[PDB]
């Protein structure tokens, strides 16, 4: 039986667990179950991309990648910057109830969509920008996605960001394998012009059962997958799989980098494993390797 003290990646100082015995139990369940029961649901911005780079270069968000493109109206990045100035403080307000935050985030994504309308746009601009950031993914991301593909594990990248940017980055990093799907806000085009974003709207606080559930198209791909790894860097990522009705065991992994001491309690109450300044996929990959080892024995 697997014991945490025998799993090196989980014994490191930066791996924090509120209840190590529960984490150990969940791991043993995933290993008993095999890869055929597993699915992954992961955030993109600052989960798949790094929170901290080695060379100190900045990493933009998926929206930032879009805003860096050259063929935007001269008005554009300034106007989105204004909207950011208004709504970002609200997004991170520590006192505001989630219901109020949700009203405001709906406003932000709506207005952002309305700005992103009325002019033509070539996806290749996005590709040119995204190409500069394929070197900014977490260490061993390539190996992680290769493991998932080899094991046939469905992997959903569930992002409140700009989907076209997410897809461009993953595709160019050679990790957008057939088992990987992206649910996000994609640019809508009509008669050759941008027309905002394709519904449904996905913002920071509805990445849950109200968007991803048993009526979703994606559900048919994963309805037999009751063991889930959920990965993200925000508290708002912890519910990404809440709409999967027959899940039996979920391991929630949170990457914590900003304001570590202030956020530590909340993160440890929300995630099963909290990874403090861990710019690698070595912990998720550890889980996959133990699942695969047993799969091989059973074969
Ligand atoms: C509509 N919106 C949300 N975010 C930000 O993207 C993050 C990742 O999903 C969100 O946390 C939010 O701060 C935006 N950023 C920019 N630059 N422009 C936007 O229109 C925008
Ligand atoms: Mg994120």
Residue numbers in the entry: 13 to 311
Passage from the reporting paper:
DmcN-IIIB was crystallized in the presence of the reaction products 7-methylguanosine (m7G) or cytidine, and a mixture of AlCl3 and NaF. The structure model of DmcN-IIIB bound to m7G was refined at a resolution of 1.65 Å to R and Rfree values of 15.9% and 19.4%, respectively. The final model of the DmcN-IIIB m7G complex contains two molecules in the asymmetric unit with one continuous segment encompassing residues 13–311 of molecule A as well as residues 13–312 of molecule B, both superposing with a root mean square deviation (rmsd) of 0.86 Å for 288 common Cα atoms (residues 13–103 and 115–311). After all amino acids had been placed, additional density was observed in the active center, which, based on its shape, could be assigned as an octahedrally coordinated magnesium ion, the co-crystallized product nucleoside m7G as well as a metal fluoride transition state analog. It was shown that for pH values higher than 7.0, enzyme-MgF3 complexes rather than enzyme-AlF3 complexes are formed. The overall structure of DmcN-IIIB consists of two domains: the globular core domain and a smaller cap domain. The cap domain packs against the top of the HAD core and is composed of two regions, a C1-type cap (red) and a C2-type cap (blue). The co-crystallized reaction product 7-methylguanosine (m7G) is bound between the cap domain and the HAD core and is represented as stick model (carbon in yellow, nitrogen in blue, oxygen in red). Moreover, the slightly higher affinity of human cN-IIIB for m7GMP compared to DmcN-IIIB could be explained by the fact that one of the stacking residues in the Drosophila protein, Phe75, is replaced by a tyrosine (Tyr60) in the human counterpart.
Although the intracellular 5′-nucleotidases generally share a low sequence similarity, all enzymes are magnesium-dependent and belong to the haloacid dehalogenase (HAD) superfamily. They are characterized by a modular architecture, containing a structurally conserved HAD core domain, which contains the catalytic residues, and an enzyme-specific cap domain consisting of one or more cap insertions. To gain insight into the broad substrate specificity of cN-IIIB and especially its unusual preference for m7GMP, we determined crystal structures of Drosophila melanogaster cN-IIIB (DmcN-IIIB) bound to different reaction products. The overall structure of DmcN-IIIB is similar to cN-IIIA, however, critical residues conferring substrate specificity and determining the size of the substrate-binding pocket are different.
